[PDB]
Design a protein around this nucleic acid. Structure first.
Ligand SMILES: [K+]
Ligand SMILES: [K+]
Ligand SMILES: [K+]
Ligand SMILES: [K+]
Ligand SMILES: [K+]
Ligand SMILES: [K+]
Ligand SMILES: [K+]
Ligand SMILES: [K+]
Ligand SMILES: [K+]
Ligand SMILES: [Mg+2]
Ligand SMILES: [Mg+2]
Ligand SMILES: [Mg+2]
Ligand SMILES: [Mg+2]
Ligand SMILES: [Mg+2]
Ligand SMILES: [Mg+2]
Ligand SMILES: [Mg+2]
Ligand SMILES: [Mg+2]
Ligand SMILES: [Mg+2]
Ligand SMILES: [Mg+2]
Ligand SMILES: [Mg+2]
Ligand SMILES: [Mg+2]
Ligand SMILES: [Mg+2]
Ligand SMILES: [Mg+2]
Lengths: 153, 129, 84, 99, 117, 100, 206
RNA sequence: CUCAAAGGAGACUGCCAGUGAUAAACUGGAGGAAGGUGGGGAUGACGUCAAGUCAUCAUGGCCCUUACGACCAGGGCUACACACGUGCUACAAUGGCGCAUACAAAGAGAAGCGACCUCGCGAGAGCAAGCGGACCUCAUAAAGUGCGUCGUAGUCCGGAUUGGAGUCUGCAACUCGACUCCAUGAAGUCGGAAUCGCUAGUAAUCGUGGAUCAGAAUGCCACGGUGAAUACGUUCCCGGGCCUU
């Protein structure tokens, strides 16, 4: 906004693990305010991921987030003349938000049976650097690299 | 730690009366167990939070009656009432409870519907022509 | 439709008219404005001129018309298509 | 025991009526329970304020009906007859029940 | 897997499979299964012929398939050749149950027909 | 509203009041489950003989000061416009602008 | 834009109601209609009596009408003859026993309804509208109002194009709810049509 | 004790620190339920658009007066090659269906709300308590949770359309009512150019009530339940405020 008067809102940690990171992931996945449904989906997918891999749910989730998190994005900047796509560094909070949003969108786009299964498959693919939201991170990085010459506007 | 201590909690349209006394850790809400009444893990955590913070979970017995609102509102009202009961029991926990943010009464209520709007703020779809 | 426990509806004036017409050999059309009357199994054979709003159209009552209202056979709106 | 039910559009008027009722009931020997403030009724109305169209331009009004209950337990003979002749102020509705 | 002159699916529950008959919905299928004494959640693939033959006569108790189609066609034809208001609506393809025609009515009218010049 | 339109309403109210019971007992006879099959027919035929204006369903609530047939309010007996005018003038007891 | 009614917005704060009775829904509309008829008859009858306010009460199965007037002698008549006649007619209209009380409006120049009616009578007598409004404002200010505003709208002086003209002195703080604002309107029916008059009078904050 | 409703207290940059022109004020901290206009509403300046309303009402002028006035029955305002606006329901598995089982607020009621019991698959019917109401009735909240099934199919999605049979209101459901049962089972598999709302208990989603009203809401007004995402910033689009040219 113009006035710069927006603070921050505290978020309760998730029940099973007490991680605000996972609580934010549940919030992103939630639709129509059905938080219990979102939590059940997330927990089922996390248990499937944990039994697929050798790490805990939090460790596997962190691996997937590390593989999907972007570092530099492109934003439009209009100056005297034409608008340029300037590459800008992404702050850590936005890195996490983008990683979660891309993962959720990719899982929703997948075509498996259940949403929990789709989320588990997407998380495993992210941990192995395959599939969507990983291609999305790659596309964002490619655009930033192509527009690197404009990193002074 | 010899007599009953009382607390009132409120959240949304929920009001909760909390009676606390020394005990072993049994919680009754509306003549039911905590797990019987609150099937939501979030609600269970909200109810348990002050006790976990003060490390007195198994030193007390909880007798709680609630009315109004829904699951989350009743859980929050119970948490507020438990915080007030603990403050009545011992007055040295006020600082830590306020630091955790449990002393504050959450005043967020449902915004009224208004003329010309579909809801509190959602306006009907606009068209120039 | 009308409840069974109340029986089919019929206007009293039309009932009197059909009673006076059936016993006699009167084959003249029975002019009426009562489109709400149910067709009863007692006036099959004679013609009833039902009002449609601006005139009386004659319907020849047959057996298959029993149970219908008189207005069902007197359309009220004139339509011939757009640009036809 | 007798029940006094007081209705009013003005809570100050209803408070005056209840105060005088309890005074004239306690003076005449019989004791009084209350007065009890029953839940206020809020009737609401919404009207269009333009003579023509302008559907979103409205006035919202309300009428508040305040309600009071008075208990007279063990009413004496001089208590009973000291009630209807009090002639409370206008705008207060009084209902008497023999409970 | 052959009832009332048609073939019913074999991989579905009996209650769902029976509705494939024209004139049999969920309620009639449930009633027929109850009369036959067969569970609703059993696939007709694992049903012995001694149960299909007891389903067949129960189905025949009702009016289904060609008989029902003939009856419906006859009633509509009776309306049309009586020439009542409903018959005229059926003739012209307009809605017969007093729905609006200024807009909508697309189910009865088909897709939109743009005006020519 | 027009003077004739107001007179129509007063006439309808008068007719309904006059024929109140003579309609009620006929309707009771018609709706009687244990009634015969010919007294029901006679009652049905007789109900049509009464003037149509005697049925209470023919009445249309109108503003008692203007005759407006739309925007009526039963609590005050007036249309919305007249209710607003009286409320602002302070002539409706206990009624004020509401806000919550 | 449009402004809220100054009396209506203050009806529960600093201003009293003009009707004080209780009723259920069964008789609310009937009471409102009878009050309207009573006020109509009284206003028509006491046209020259300088009537500013008619308060109606219904204590129990009876009607009490208080008439605030600047000419109580004209209202009452000789040994109460006129007020007795009005009591009879009011009882006949309301269908209940009637009791008429007379209230004195001292300083009619500080009463909004009376000022508006005076301006309206002058306009119907074809007095200059500017002179009428200036006189009203000056009289109220001299009598000691904290403020007054007068507004006249219509075909002033028979002009073909209608317009609105207003004068104000002192302070008239219409946005202050606790301000004692007496507001009233009147209409003049001249040969060129209807002219509307509105009068606000400020009497200090409560 | 919750609560009902009357009377009071409380929040005032009041206190502390820093910055600031020894100012106004700003930034942060303490205490507190609430911190800087605490949240929401009411409240709409001088004026603008000869903006809307002579069909709420009133009113100048004009016009009709065995008619442009008055009464009645039937019809129409519900038409239908088409075009637009505002909504509702969907296209499904974060779901449909079946069984079981929790947790609201607000409101209305006397030609009214109508319980219990019996009958009917059902809409309802018969009989008949209680309530002018914190007492009785409307009136089971639903989403939610547990178990089972469906297994990606135009389907156990969707429920338009039509046939048959009924119920209730009402003199009277043909034109032209609402609701119920059986059958029927359309388009639709996420929507071009373009375009709308929303900054927090908001959006989204889920039910509930009321006015109008004999009957007739997907509209309107109101009430709770669950409950987000995001705001780096003011270069750009729209509207506006102040100074200057
Ligand atoms: K349309
Ligand atoms: K005129
Ligand atoms: K019609
Ligand atoms: K139609
Ligand atoms: K709609
Ligand atoms: K639309
Ligand atoms: K289907
Ligand atoms: K109809
Ligand atoms: K400029
Ligand atoms: Mg809501
Ligand atoms: Mg518009
Ligand atoms: Mg079938
Ligand atoms: Mg007139
Ligand atoms: Mg009507
Ligand atoms: Mg202000
Ligand atoms: Mg114009
Ligand atoms: Mg116009
Ligand atoms: Mg007519
Ligand atoms: Mg229309
Ligand atoms: Mg279905
Ligand atoms: Mg905003
Ligand atoms: Mg209704
Ligand atoms: Mg400024």
């Amino acid at each position: 906004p113009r006035r710069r008067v927006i603070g921050q809102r505290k978020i309760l940690p998730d029940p099973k693990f007490g991680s605000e990171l996972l609580a934010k992931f549940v919030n992103i996945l939630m639709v129509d305010g059905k938080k219990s449904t979102a939590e059940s989906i997330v927990y089922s997918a996390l248990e499937t991921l944990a039994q697929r891999s050798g790490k805990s749910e939090l460790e596997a989730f962190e691996v997937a987030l590390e593989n999907v998190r972007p570092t530099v994005e492109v934003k439009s900047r209009r100056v005297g003349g034409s608008t340029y796509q300037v590459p800008v560094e992404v702050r850590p909070v936005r890195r996490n938000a983008l990683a979660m949003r891309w993962i959720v969108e990719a899982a929703r786009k997948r075509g498996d049976k259940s949403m929990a299964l789709r989320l588990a498959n997407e998380l495993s693919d992210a941990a192995e650097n395959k599939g969507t939201a990983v291609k999305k991170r790659e596309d964002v990085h490619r655009m930033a690299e192509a527009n690197k010459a404009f990193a002074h506007y | 730690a010899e007599n009953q201590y009382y607390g009132t909690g409120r959240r949304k349209s929920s009001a909760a009366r909390v009676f606390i006394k020394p005990g072993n850790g049994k919680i009754v809400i509306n003549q039911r167990s905590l797990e019987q009444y609150f099937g939501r893990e979030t609600a269970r955590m909200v109810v348990r939070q002050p006790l976990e913070l003060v490390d007195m979970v198994e030193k007390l017995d909880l007798y709680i009656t609630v009315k109004g609102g829904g699951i989350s509102g009743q859980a929050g009202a119970i948490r507020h009432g438990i915080t007030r009961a603990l403050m009545e029991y011992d007055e040295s926990l006020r600082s830590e409870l306020r630091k955790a943010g449990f002393v504050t009464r959450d005043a967020r209520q449902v915004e009224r519907k208004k003329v010309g709007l579909r809801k509190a703020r959602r306006r009907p779809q606009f068209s120039k022509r | 439709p009308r409840s069974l426990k109340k029986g089919p509806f019929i206007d009293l004036h039309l009932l009197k008219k059909v009673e006076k017409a059936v016993e006699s050999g009167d084959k003249k059309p029975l002019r009426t404005w009562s489109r709400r009357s149910t067709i009863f199994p007692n006036m099959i054979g004679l013609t009833i001129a039902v009002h449609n709003g601006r005139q009386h159209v004659p319907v020849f009552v047959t057996d298959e018309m029993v149970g219908h209202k008189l207005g069902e056979f007197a359309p009220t709106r004139t339509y011939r298509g757009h640009a036809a | 025991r007798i029940r006094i039910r007081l209705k009013a559009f003005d809570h100050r008027l209803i408070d005056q009526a209840t105060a005088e009722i309890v005074e004239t009931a306690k003076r005449t020997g019989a004791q009084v329970r209350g007065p009890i403030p029953l839940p206020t009724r809020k009737e609401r109305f919404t009207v269009l304020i333009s003579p023509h169209v302008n559907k979103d331009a409205r006035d919202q009004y309300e009428i508040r009906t305040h309600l009071r209950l008075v208990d007279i337990v063990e009413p004496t003979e001089k208590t009973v007859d000291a009630l209807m002749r009090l002639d409370l102020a206008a705008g207060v509705d009084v209902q008497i029940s023999l409970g | 897997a052959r009832i009332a002159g048609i073939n019913i699916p074999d991989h579905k529950h009996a209650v769902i499979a029976l509705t494939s008959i024209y004139g049999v919905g969920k309620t009639r299928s449930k009633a027929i299964l109850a009369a036959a004494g067969i569970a609703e959640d059993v696939k007709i693939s694992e049903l012995s012929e001694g149960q299909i033959d007891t389903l067949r006569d129960e189905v025949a108790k009702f009016v289904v398939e060609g008989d029902l189609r003939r009856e419906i066609s006859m009633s509509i034809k009776r309306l049309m050749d009586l020439g009542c208001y409903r018959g005229l609506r059926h003739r012209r393809g307009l809605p017969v149950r007093g729905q609006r025609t200024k807009t909508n009515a697309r189910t009865r009218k088909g897709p939109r027909k743009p005006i020519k010049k | 509203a027009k003077q004739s339109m107001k007179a129509r309403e007063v006439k309808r109210v008068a007719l309904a009041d006059k024929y109140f019971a003579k309609r009620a007992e006929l309707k009771a006879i018609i709706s009687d489950v244990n009634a015969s099959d010919e007294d029901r027919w006679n009652a049905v035929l007789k109900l049509q003989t009464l003037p149509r204006d005697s049925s209470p369903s023919r009445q249309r609530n109108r503003c008692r000061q203007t005759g407006r047939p739309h925007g009526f309010l039963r609590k005050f007996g007036l249309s919305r416009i007249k209710v607003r005018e009286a409320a602002m003038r302070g002539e409706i007891p206990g009624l004020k602008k509401a806000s919550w | 834009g449009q402004k809220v009614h100054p009396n209506g917005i203050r009806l529960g704060i600093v201003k009293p109601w003009n009707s004080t009775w209780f009723a259920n829904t069964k008789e609310f509309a009937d009471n409102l209609d009878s009050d309207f008829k009573v006020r109509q008859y009284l206003t028509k009858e006491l046209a020259k009596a300088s009537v500013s306010r008619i308060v109606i009460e219904r204590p129990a199965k009876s009607i009490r009408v208080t008439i605030h007037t600047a000419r109580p002698g004209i209202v009452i008549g000789k040994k109460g003859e006129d007020v007795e006649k009005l009591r009879k007619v009011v009882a006949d209209i309301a269908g209940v026993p009637a009791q008429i009380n007379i209230a004195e409006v001292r300083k009619p120049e500080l009463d909004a309804k009376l000022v508006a009616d005076s301006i309206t009578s002058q306009l119907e007598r074809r007095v200059m509208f500017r002179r009428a409004m200036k006189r009203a404002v000056q009289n109220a200010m001299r009598l000691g109002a904290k403020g007054i505003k007068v507004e006249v709208s219509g075909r002033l002086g028979g002009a073909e194009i209608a317009r609105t003209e207003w004068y104000r002195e002192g302070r008239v703080p219409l946005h202050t709810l606790r301000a004692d604002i007496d507001y009233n309107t009147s209409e003049a029916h001249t040969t060129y049509g209807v002219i509307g008059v509105k009068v606000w009078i400020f009497k200090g904050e409560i």
